[PDB]
Design a protein around this ligand. Structure first.
Ligand SMILES: Nc1ncnc2c1ncn2[C@@H]1O[C@H](COP(=O)(O)OP(=O)(O)OP(=O)(O)O)[C@@H](O)[C@H]1O
Ligand SMILES: O=C(NOCCO)C1=CC=C(F)C(F)/C1=N\c1ccc(I)cc1F
Ligand SMILES: [Mg+2]
Length: 260
């Protein structure tokens, strides 16, 4: 259904480690979509795997997950086509917005945790990559998650900087899982709250950095400037220990979101 020649570059939405994304127009349909090119030097068998595994994204419908239209391969570059969210990613919003208010972070948290639990229950997958830039917003006030790990093979093929939102345990070994996403969210809401990457507490090299998050105490929210309920919420996400750390059920019925 989706083909390379059937598209038309409109503008460029942004870029990261391994992917470029364009605001594009799907001629046959008129739909404005976001198209993500991932450059992969890869053999036909696996190139087909990744595509085959991306089909699952047709079954990912939630108001908390970014819509998916199709995926295909075109000249050394794999394509994922998705809902264009005309507000961009929270990392952008933060840059232009200085710091994001506690009340809004509240709406954001609701969405992220609803999004995570949907991917867990209905599809049995962890997100693996939650952080401000993988949470998209749109003018209809929607707040959706993208770039979650639906395809093992694509994670593989992409085995290949500054900030990390990876959990202490994921940083330390392969002994991690869905609990790891919670830490990410924790860290992301702290970032967006204060307007700055919260490590170290208010220019740091890779080991300094990575060593801080695994050996030094977790970041906390500034005091007095944020409700005690926001504090406890973040605090329960950022607990070094995966088992002690809040799980998805517990955060759903936490005070902070209840207030939200
Ligand atoms: N569906 C979409 N709708 C609107 N904007 C998008 C969409 N997907 C990505 N973007 C924007 O384009 C950028 C592309 O992000 P991409 O996933 O390629 O790298 P990243 O996630 O920002 O960072 P990294 O890959 O380094 O983790 C994002 O920062 C976001 O601003
Ligand atoms: O984009 C990724 N990582 O981002 C890194 C910068 O390219 C991805 C990594 C692993 C996967 F399985 C992915 F599907 C995936 N991409 C998407 C997943 C869901 C939607 I809705 C849209 C996506 F684009
Ligand atoms: Mg992304």
């Amino acid at each position: 259904e989706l083909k390379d020649d059937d598209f038309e570059k409109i503008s460029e939405l942004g870029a990261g480690n391994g992917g470029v994304v364009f605001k594009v127009s799907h001629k046959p349909s008129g739909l404005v979509m976001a198209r993500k090119l991932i450059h992969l030097e890869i053999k036909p068998a696996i190139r087909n795997q990744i595509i085959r595994e991306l089909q699952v994204l047709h079954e990912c419908n939630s108001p908390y997950i970014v819509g998916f239209y199709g995926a295909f391969y075109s000249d050394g570059e794999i394509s994922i086509c998705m809902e264009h969210m005309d507000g961009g990613s929270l990392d952008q919003v933060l840059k232009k917005a200085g710091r994001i208010p506690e009340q809004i972070l509240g709406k954001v948290s609701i969405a992220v945790i609803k999004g995570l639990t949907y991917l867990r229950e209905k599809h049995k997958i962890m997100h693996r990559d939650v952080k401000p830039s993988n949470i998209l917003v749109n003018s209809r006030g929607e707040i959706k998650l993208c770039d979650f790990g639906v395809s093992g093979q694509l994670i593989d093929s992409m085995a290949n900087g500054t900030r990390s939102y990876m959990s202490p345990e994921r940083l330390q070994g392969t002994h991690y899982s869905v609990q790891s996403d919670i830490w990410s969210m924790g860290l992301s809401l702290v970032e967006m709250a204060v307007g700055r990457y919260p490590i170290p507490p208010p220019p740091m090299a890779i080991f300094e950095l990575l060593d801080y998050i695994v050996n030094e105490p977790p970041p906390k929210l500034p005091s007095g400037v944020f409700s005690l309920e926001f504090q406890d919420f973040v605090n329960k996400c950022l607990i070094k220990n995966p088992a002690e750390r809040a799980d998805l059920k517990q955060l759903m019925v936490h005070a902070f979101i209840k207030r939200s």
